[PDB]
Amino acid sequence: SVVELGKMIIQETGKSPFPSYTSYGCFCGGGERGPPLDATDRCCLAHSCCYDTLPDCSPKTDRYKYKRENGEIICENSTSCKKRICECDKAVAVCLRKNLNTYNKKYTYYPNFWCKGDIEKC
């Protein structure tokens, strides 16, 4: 859920989802219209695409457990939805970290109605 996702994001990037990523570019916090503004925005695109393969779940409200062994995020659940959502969050947390050097503060609050390209799908 939002709790664990934020925990991962904070641990990987040093930034809090709000307000650093909740409205970033065209895809962070939600969005289907692109193109992505940069690598960070693409991480979010991938994250929503991930959540989209979880129709039987509630990604933002279903809690889950995870630990960190040898520095890596390890999703501890076997329970279907919990394990899947966790893998989706781990992926975005690490992606944002990998692309942290291009994070642009001018994109933090990018208007969503300024995103008028095609639907990226994934």
Which residues are catalytically annotated?
47, 89
CA dist., res. 19 & res. 35, Å (int): 21
Contact 12, 96 (CB under 8 A): yes
Task: Give 113's contacts (C-beta < 8 A, 6+ positions apart).
Answer: none
Contact 48, 27 (CB under 8 A): yes
SS (H, E, C) 64-105: CCEEEECCEEEECCCCHHHHHHHHHHHHHHHHHHHCHHHCCH
Helix (H, G, I), strand (E, B) or coil at 33: strand
